[PDB]
DNA sequence: TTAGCTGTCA
DNA sequence: TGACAGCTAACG
């Protein structure tokens, strides 16, 4: 929900459109850089992939 | 058994 | 768009 939390999560995503699956090291590092919880970080990407990444694939 | 994906509500 | 119950794939 934090406006900042979105930005930090958006960057890594588009910085890894081919491998949008972070590691346990990056998951916590994102959580610390956002203050969110691990579960919050986990769910965000899973939603982001099918709402940000996948739609662009369809357009190709 | 855990990471990830689908379906889905407020 | 952030939640989580439920199903699915990579026997210890």
Curated annotation (Swiss-Prot):
Superkingdom, natural source? Eukaryota
- Intracellular or extracellular location(s): Nucleus; Cytoplasm, Perinuclear region
Report where it is expressed, by tissue.
Answer: Expressed in various tissues. Expressed at high level in the lymphoid organs of hematopoietic tissues. Also expressed in some regions of the brain, such as the putamen.
Q: Which residues does UniProt assign to DNA binding?
A: 1-56
Cysteine disulfide links: none
Which residues, by range, are in coiled-coil regions? none
- Protein name per the record: Homeobox protein Meis2
Q: Which organism is it from?
A: Homo sapiens
């Amino acid at each position: 929900f934090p406006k900042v939390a979105t930005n930090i999560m958006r960057a890594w995503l588009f910085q890894h459109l081919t491998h949008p699956y972070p590691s346990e090291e990056q998951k916590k590092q994102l959580a610390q850089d956002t203050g969110l919880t691990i579960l919050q970080v986990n769910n965000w990407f899973i939603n982001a992939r099918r709402r940000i990444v996948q739609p662009m694939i369809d357009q190709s």
